[PDB]
Amino acid sequence: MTLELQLKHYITNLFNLPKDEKWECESIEEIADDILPDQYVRLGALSNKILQTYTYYSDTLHESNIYPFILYYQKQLIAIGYIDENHDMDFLYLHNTIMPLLDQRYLLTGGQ
Amino acid sequence: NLLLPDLWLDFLQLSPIFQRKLAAVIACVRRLRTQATVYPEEDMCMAWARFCDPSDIKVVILGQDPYHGGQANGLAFSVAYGFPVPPSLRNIYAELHRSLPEFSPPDHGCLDAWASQGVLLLNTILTVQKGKPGSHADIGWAWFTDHVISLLSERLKACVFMLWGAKAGDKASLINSKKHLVLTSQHPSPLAQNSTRKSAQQKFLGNNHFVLANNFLREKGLGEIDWRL
Protein backbone atom coordinates (compact mmCIF):
# COMPACT_ATOMS: atom_id res chain seq x y z
CA MET A 1 0.00 0.00 0.00
CA THR A 2 3.09 2.21 0.04
CA LEU A 3 2.85 3.13 -3.64
CA GLU A 4 -0.84 4.11 -3.47
CA LEU A 5 -0.06 6.35 -0.49
CA GLN A 6 2.86 7.98 -2.30
CA LEU A 7 0.66 8.62 -5.35
CA LYS A 8 -2.12 10.08 -3.19
CA HIS A 9 0.36 12.38 -1.42
CA TYR A 10 1.82 13.51 -4.76
CA ILE A 11 -1.57 14.12 -6.40
CA THR A 12 -3.15 15.94 -3.45
CA ASN A 13 -0.06 18.17 -3.22
CA LEU A 14 0.06 18.86 -6.97
CA PHE A 15 -3.65 19.69 -7.23
CA ASN A 16 -4.12 21.13 -3.71
CA LEU A 17 -6.74 18.55 -2.73
CA PRO A 18 -7.86 17.66 0.81
CA LYS A 19 -5.26 15.29 2.26
CA ASP A 20 -7.87 13.50 4.39
CA GLU A 21 -10.46 12.80 1.68
CA LYS A 22 -10.87 9.07 1.14
CA TRP A 23 -9.87 7.73 -2.26
CA GLU A 24 -11.72 4.78 -3.73
CA CYS A 25 -10.39 2.40 -6.37
CA GLU A 26 -11.76 0.80 -9.54
CA SER A 27 -9.82 -2.25 -10.79
CA ILE A 28 -10.20 -3.88 -14.21
CA GLU A 29 -7.96 -6.08 -16.35
CA GLU A 30 -7.30 -5.03 -19.93
CA ILE A 31 -4.63 -5.51 -22.58
CA ALA A 32 -1.90 -2.87 -22.59
CA ASP A 33 -2.60 -1.95 -26.22
CA ASP A 34 -5.95 -0.40 -25.26
CA ILE A 35 -4.80 1.61 -22.22
CA LEU A 36 -1.27 2.86 -22.94
CA PRO A 37 -0.04 5.34 -25.58
CA ASP A 38 0.90 3.70 -28.88
CA GLN A 39 4.58 4.65 -28.59
CA TYR A 40 4.94 2.64 -25.36
CA VAL A 41 3.37 -0.62 -26.61
CA ARG A 42 5.76 -2.74 -28.65
CA LEU A 43 6.03 -6.32 -29.86
CA GLY A 44 8.00 -8.45 -27.42
CA ALA A 45 7.37 -5.93 -24.63
CA LEU A 46 3.99 -4.60 -23.49
CA SER A 47 2.04 -5.56 -26.61
CA ASN A 48 -0.74 -8.11 -26.00
CA LYS A 49 -0.07 -8.32 -22.25
CA ILE A 50 -3.05 -8.14 -19.90
CA LEU A 51 -2.52 -5.48 -17.23
CA GLN A 52 -4.17 -5.31 -13.81
CA THR A 53 -5.17 -1.71 -13.20
CA TYR A 54 -6.03 0.56 -10.26
CA THR A 55 -7.81 3.85 -11.00
CA TYR A 56 -8.53 6.13 -8.07
CA TYR A 57 -11.55 8.39 -7.74
CA SER A 58 -13.28 10.73 -5.29
CA ASP A 59 -15.45 13.84 -5.36
CA THR A 60 -12.56 16.31 -5.61
CA LEU A 61 -10.69 14.06 -8.05
CA HIS A 62 -13.77 14.18 -10.28
CA GLU A 63 -13.93 17.96 -9.83
CA SER A 64 -10.31 18.21 -10.99
CA ASN A 65 -10.94 15.92 -14.01
CA ILE A 66 -7.96 13.70 -13.14
CA TYR A 67 -7.68 9.93 -12.79
CA PRO A 68 -4.63 8.73 -10.82
CA PHE A 69 -3.68 5.19 -11.75
CA ILE A 70 -1.28 2.33 -11.09
CA LEU A 71 -0.75 -0.52 -13.56
CA TYR A 72 0.77 -3.97 -12.96
CA TYR A 73 1.61 -7.04 -15.03
CA GLN A 74 1.43 -10.04 -12.69
CA LYS A 75 3.57 -8.80 -9.76
CA GLN A 76 5.62 -6.38 -11.90
CA LEU A 77 4.93 -2.67 -11.49
CA ILE A 78 4.16 -1.29 -14.95
CA ALA A 79 3.01 2.28 -14.45
CA ILE A 80 2.35 5.09 -12.00
CA GLY A 81 0.66 8.25 -13.19
CA TYR A 82 -2.57 10.08 -13.79
CA ILE A 83 -4.89 11.05 -16.61
CA ASP A 84 -5.07 14.82 -16.74
CA GLU A 85 -7.73 17.38 -17.64
CA ASN A 86 -7.04 16.93 -21.37
CA HIS A 87 -7.33 13.13 -20.94
CA ASP A 88 -3.57 12.83 -21.52
CA MET A 89 -1.66 10.24 -19.53
CA ASP A 90 1.16 11.70 -17.43
CA PHE A 91 3.56 9.11 -16.05
CA LEU A 92 5.60 9.18 -12.89
CA TYR A 93 6.80 5.70 -13.82
CA LEU A 94 6.54 3.39 -16.83
CA HIS A 95 8.12 -0.04 -17.33
CA ASN A 96 7.60 -2.26 -20.38
CA THR A 97 8.27 -5.62 -18.57
CA ILE A 98 11.86 -5.45 -19.88
CA MET A 99 13.14 -2.17 -18.43
CA PRO A 100 11.93 1.22 -17.17
CA LEU A 101 10.87 3.54 -19.98
CA LEU A 102 10.11 6.51 -17.70
CA ASP A 103 11.11 7.10 -14.08
CA GLN A 104 10.32 10.28 -12.16
CA ARG A 105 9.78 8.40 -8.90
CA TYR A 106 12.16 10.90 -7.30
CA LEU A 107 8.99 13.03 -7.24
CA LEU A 108 7.63 10.38 -4.86
CA THR A 109 8.76 9.99 -1.26
CA GLY A 110 10.20 6.52 -1.89
CA GLY A 111 13.76 7.40 -2.84
CA GLN A 112 13.62 5.45 -6.12
CA ASN B 1 -28.29 -23.46 0.10
CA LEU B 2 -27.18 -22.22 -3.33
CA LEU B 3 -27.95 -18.56 -2.43
CA LEU B 4 -29.91 -18.19 -5.68
CA PRO B 5 -33.62 -17.32 -5.82
CA ASP B 6 -36.00 -20.17 -6.56
CA LEU B 7 -36.80 -18.75 -10.00
CA TRP B 8 -33.11 -18.94 -10.89
CA LEU B 9 -32.87 -22.52 -9.62
CA ASP B 10 -35.86 -23.38 -11.83
CA PHE B 11 -34.27 -21.50 -14.75
CA LEU B 12 -30.82 -23.10 -14.54
CA GLN B 13 -32.02 -26.68 -13.90
CA LEU B 14 -28.62 -27.46 -12.40
CA SER B 15 -27.66 -31.13 -12.45
CA PRO B 16 -26.82 -32.66 -9.05
CA ILE B 17 -23.08 -32.50 -9.81
CA PHE B 18 -23.34 -28.86 -10.90
CA GLN B 19 -25.28 -28.15 -7.71
CA ARG B 20 -22.44 -29.70 -5.71
CA LYS B 21 -19.80 -27.72 -7.64
CA LEU B 22 -21.64 -24.45 -6.96
CA ALA B 23 -22.06 -25.44 -3.30
CA ALA B 24 -18.31 -26.08 -3.19
CA VAL B 25 -17.52 -22.61 -4.51
CA ILE B 26 -19.89 -21.12 -1.93
CA ALA B 27 -18.15 -23.17 0.77
CA CYS B 28 -14.74 -21.93 -0.40
CA VAL B 29 -15.91 -18.33 -0.06
CA ARG B 30 -17.30 -19.15 3.40
CA ARG B 31 -13.88 -20.45 4.45
CA LEU B 32 -12.12 -17.38 3.05
CA ARG B 33 -14.51 -15.00 4.85
CA THR B 34 -13.23 -15.99 8.31
CA GLN B 35 -9.65 -15.14 7.32
CA ALA B 36 -10.20 -11.78 5.59
CA THR B 37 -12.75 -9.21 4.48
CA VAL B 38 -14.67 -10.41 1.42
CA TYR B 39 -16.99 -8.28 -0.73
CA PRO B 40 -19.84 -8.28 -1.06
CA GLU B 41 -21.52 -9.95 1.92
CA GLU B 42 -22.75 -13.49 1.29
CA ASP B 43 -26.40 -12.41 1.16
CA MET B 44 -25.53 -9.75 -1.43
CA CYS B 45 -23.32 -11.74 -3.81
CA MET B 46 -26.46 -12.94 -5.65
CA ALA B 47 -28.27 -9.58 -5.58
CA TRP B 48 -27.90 -9.42 -9.38
CA ALA B 49 -30.36 -12.33 -9.60
CA ARG B 50 -33.14 -10.88 -7.41
CA PHE B 51 -34.48 -7.93 -9.44
CA CYS B 52 -36.51 -9.73 -12.13
CA ASP B 53 -37.58 -13.14 -13.29
CA PRO B 54 -34.80 -14.72 -15.39
CA SER B 55 -37.27 -15.39 -18.21
CA ASP B 56 -37.77 -11.60 -18.46
CA ILE B 57 -34.07 -10.77 -18.96
CA LYS B 58 -33.58 -8.58 -22.05
CA VAL B 59 -30.04 -7.18 -21.69
CA VAL B 60 -26.93 -8.76 -20.15
CA ILE B 61 -24.01 -6.50 -19.19
CA LEU B 62 -20.82 -8.26 -18.07
CA GLY B 63 -18.37 -6.98 -15.49
CA GLN B 64 -15.23 -8.61 -14.15
CA ASP B 65 -15.07 -8.80 -10.36
CA PRO B 66 -16.78 -6.69 -7.66
CA TYR B 67 -15.38 -3.47 -6.28
CA HIS B 68 -12.92 -4.29 -3.50
CA GLY B 69 -13.28 -1.29 -1.18
CA GLY B 70 -16.77 -1.83 0.21
CA GLN B 71 -18.76 -0.07 -2.51
CA ALA B 72 -19.94 -3.23 -4.32
CA ASN B 73 -23.66 -4.02 -4.11
CA GLY B 74 -23.85 -7.36 -5.93
CA LEU B 75 -24.43 -5.75 -9.34
CA ALA B 76 -21.86 -5.16 -12.06
CA PHE B 77 -20.62 -1.54 -12.28
CA SER B 78 -23.25 -0.24 -9.86
CA VAL B 79 -22.49 1.17 -6.41
CA ALA B 80 -24.85 1.67 -3.49
CA TYR B 81 -26.54 5.00 -2.82
CA GLY B 82 -24.28 7.56 -1.18
CA PHE B 83 -21.11 6.24 -2.83
CA PRO B 84 -19.27 8.34 -5.44
CA VAL B 85 -19.80 7.18 -9.02
CA PRO B 86 -16.81 5.09 -10.22
CA PRO B 87 -14.99 6.13 -13.42
CA SER B 88 -16.27 3.39 -15.74
CA LEU B 89 -19.84 4.08 -14.64
CA ARG B 90 -19.33 7.79 -15.31
CA ASN B 91 -18.23 6.94 -18.85
CA ILE B 92 -21.23 4.64 -19.25
CA TYR B 93 -23.38 7.62 -18.25
CA ALA B 94 -21.49 9.75 -20.79
CA GLU B 95 -22.32 7.35 -23.61
CA LEU B 96 -25.95 7.20 -22.48
CA HIS B 97 -26.08 11.01 -22.50
CA ARG B 98 -24.50 11.20 -25.96
CA SER B 99 -26.82 8.57 -27.45
CA LEU B 100 -30.12 9.27 -25.63
CA PRO B 101 -31.39 12.87 -25.54
CA GLU B 102 -33.71 12.16 -22.60
CA PHE B 103 -30.89 10.70 -20.47
CA SER B 104 -29.23 13.02 -17.96
CA PRO B 105 -26.27 11.61 -15.96
CA PRO B 106 -27.37 11.06 -12.35
CA ASP B 107 -25.50 11.89 -9.15
CA HIS B 108 -25.62 8.26 -7.96
CA GLY B 109 -24.37 4.88 -9.10
CA CYS B 110 -27.54 2.89 -8.41
CA LEU B 111 -28.56 0.72 -11.37
CA ASP B 112 -31.47 -0.97 -9.56
CA ALA B 113 -34.08 0.38 -12.02
CA TRP B 114 -32.18 -1.17 -14.93
CA ALA B 115 -32.06 -4.51 -13.12
CA SER B 116 -35.78 -4.33 -12.34
CA GLN B 117 -36.47 -3.78 -16.05
CA GLY B 118 -34.59 -6.96 -17.03
CA VAL B 119 -31.00 -5.73 -17.36
CA LEU B 120 -28.78 -8.43 -15.85
CA LEU B 121 -25.65 -6.79 -14.39
CA LEU B 122 -23.46 -9.88 -14.11
CA ASN B 123 -19.90 -9.85 -12.81
CA THR B 124 -18.09 -12.96 -14.05
CA ILE B 125 -16.42 -13.19 -10.61
CA LEU B 126 -18.89 -12.76 -7.77
CA THR B 127 -16.61 -12.15 -4.76
CA VAL B 128 -13.32 -10.39 -4.03
CA GLN B 129 -11.01 -9.98 -1.05
CA LYS B 130 -10.76 -6.41 0.26
CA GLY B 131 -8.10 -4.41 -1.57
CA LYS B 132 -7.05 -7.33 -3.81
CA PRO B 133 -8.61 -7.25 -7.30
CA GLY B 134 -8.77 -10.66 -8.94
CA SER B 135 -8.08 -12.45 -5.65
CA HIS B 136 -11.09 -14.74 -6.18
CA ALA B 137 -10.62 -15.15 -9.94
CA ASP B 138 -9.69 -18.85 -9.63
CA ILE B 139 -12.00 -20.22 -6.91
CA GLY B 140 -14.67 -21.38 -9.36
CA TRP B 141 -16.92 -18.36 -9.99
CA ALA B 142 -15.89 -18.24 -13.66
CA TRP B 143 -17.26 -21.74 -14.30
CA PHE B 144 -20.58 -20.73 -12.74
CA THR B 145 -21.01 -17.41 -14.54
CA ASP B 146 -19.90 -18.98 -17.85
CA HIS B 147 -22.65 -21.55 -17.38
CA VAL B 148 -25.15 -18.79 -16.52
CA ILE B 149 -24.24 -16.94 -19.74
CA SER B 150 -24.58 -20.14 -21.78
CA LEU B 151 -27.99 -20.88 -20.27
CA LEU B 152 -29.21 -17.32 -20.82
CA SER B 153 -28.25 -17.65 -24.49
CA GLU B 154 -29.90 -21.07 -24.77
CA ARG B 155 -33.12 -20.43 -22.83
CA LEU B 156 -33.97 -16.84 -23.79
CA LYS B 157 -35.67 -16.29 -27.14
CA ALA B 158 -34.13 -12.85 -27.72
CA CYS B 159 -31.57 -11.01 -25.60
CA VAL B 160 -28.89 -8.31 -25.89
CA PHE B 161 -25.37 -8.97 -24.58
CA MET B 162 -23.01 -6.01 -24.04
CA LEU B 163 -19.35 -7.11 -23.88
CA TRP B 164 -16.95 -4.23 -23.10
CA GLY B 165 -13.20 -4.87 -23.25
CA ALA B 166 -11.13 -7.98 -23.86
CA LYS B 167 -12.18 -9.95 -20.77
CA ALA B 168 -15.91 -9.59 -21.41
CA GLY B 169 -15.30 -10.04 -25.14
CA ASP B 170 -13.86 -13.48 -24.44
CA LYS B 171 -17.39 -14.58 -23.43
CA ALA B 172 -18.85 -13.96 -26.92
CA SER B 173 -18.17 -17.56 -27.96
CA LEU B 174 -20.66 -18.67 -25.29
CA ILE B 175 -23.53 -16.74 -26.93
CA ASN B 176 -25.64 -17.75 -29.93
CA SER B 177 -25.18 -14.61 -32.04
CA LYS B 178 -27.92 -15.70 -34.45
CA LYS B 179 -30.58 -15.63 -31.73
CA HIS B 180 -29.09 -12.73 -29.79
CA LEU B 181 -27.56 -9.33 -30.43
CA VAL B 182 -23.95 -9.34 -29.25
CA LEU B 183 -22.60 -5.79 -28.87
CA THR B 184 -18.86 -5.35 -28.38
CA SER B 185 -16.57 -2.36 -27.86
CA GLN B 186 -13.59 -1.24 -25.85
CA HIS B 187 -13.99 -0.97 -22.09
CA PRO B 188 -15.65 2.18 -20.68
CA SER B 189 -12.69 2.69 -18.32
CA PRO B 190 -11.07 6.14 -18.64
CA LEU B 191 -7.79 4.24 -19.11
CA ALA B 192 -9.12 2.92 -22.44
CA GLN B 193 -10.91 6.14 -23.42
CA ASN B 194 -8.27 8.12 -25.33
CA SER B 195 -5.88 5.83 -27.16
CA THR B 196 -4.85 4.94 -30.71
CA ARG B 197 -6.43 5.37 -34.13
CA LYS B 198 -5.47 1.69 -34.39
CA SER B 199 -7.87 -0.28 -32.16
CA ALA B 200 -9.64 -2.88 -34.30
CA GLN B 201 -12.41 -2.52 -31.70
CA GLN B 202 -14.72 0.48 -31.61
CA LYS B 203 -14.35 2.99 -28.78
CA PHE B 204 -16.80 2.80 -25.90
CA LEU B 205 -17.89 6.42 -26.27
CA GLY B 206 -19.87 6.35 -29.50
CA ASN B 207 -20.58 2.61 -29.45
CA ASN B 208 -24.35 3.35 -29.47
CA HIS B 209 -24.99 0.11 -27.56
CA PHE B 210 -28.01 1.29 -25.56
CA VAL B 211 -29.77 2.61 -28.67
CA LEU B 212 -28.96 -0.55 -30.63
CA ALA B 213 -30.20 -2.63 -27.69
CA ASN B 214 -33.57 -0.87 -27.57
CA ASN B 215 -33.88 -1.09 -31.37
CA PHE B 216 -33.35 -4.85 -31.09
CA LEU B 217 -35.92 -5.17 -28.30
CA ARG B 218 -38.47 -3.19 -30.33
CA GLU B 219 -37.81 -5.37 -33.39
CA LYS B 220 -38.42 -8.52 -31.32
CA GLY B 221 -41.65 -7.14 -29.82
CA LEU B 222 -40.25 -6.67 -26.31
CA GLY B 223 -40.65 -3.63 -24.09
CA GLU B 224 -37.73 -1.23 -24.37
CA ILE B 225 -35.54 -0.28 -21.42
CA ASP B 226 -36.01 3.15 -19.86
CA TRP B 227 -32.33 3.86 -19.17
CA ARG B 228 -33.04 7.00 -17.11
CA LEU B 229 -31.73 7.16 -13.55
CA-to-CA distance for B186 and A47, rounded, in angstroms? 16
Distance of alpha carbon A31 from its chain centroid, rounded?
Answer: 15
Cβ of A38 within 8 Å of Cβ of B69? The answer is no
Angle of helix B141-155 relative to helix B16-33, nearest 10 degrees, comes to 140
Cβ B40 vs Cβ B127: under 8 Å: yes
Please state the domain count of chain A.
Answer: 1
What CATH code would you report for B1-229?
3.40.470.10
Q: Is any Cβ of chain B less than 8 angstroms from the Cβ of A54?
A: yes
Host H or E run for residue A8: helix A2-14
Instruction: State the structure-solving technique.
Output: X-ray
Residue A67's domain is classified under what CATH number? 3.10.450.250
Residue ranges for the known binding site of A for Mg(2+) are 88-89
Contact map slice: B 85-124 vs A, CB within 8 A: 85-88, 90
Cβ of A62 within 8 Å of Cβ of B90? The answer is yes
CA-to-CA distance for B66 and B48, rounded, in angstroms? 12
CA-to-CA distance for B53 and B115, rounded, in angstroms? 10
Contacts of B48 (CB under 8 A, 6+ apart): B74, B75, B76, B115, B120, B121, B122, B123
Give the alpha-carbon dihedral of B210, B95, A25, A102, to 10 degrees: 130
Contact map slice: B 54-73 vs A, CB within 8 A: 64-65, 67-69, 71
Domain of residue A61: give its range.
Answer: 1-112
Amino acid making up residue B120: L
Cβ of A55 within 8 Å of Cβ of B165? The answer is no
Q: Where are the domains of chain B?
A: 1-229
Contacts of A37 (CB under 8 A, 6+ apart): A89, B195, B196
CA-to-CA distance for B217 and B226, rounded, in angstroms? 12
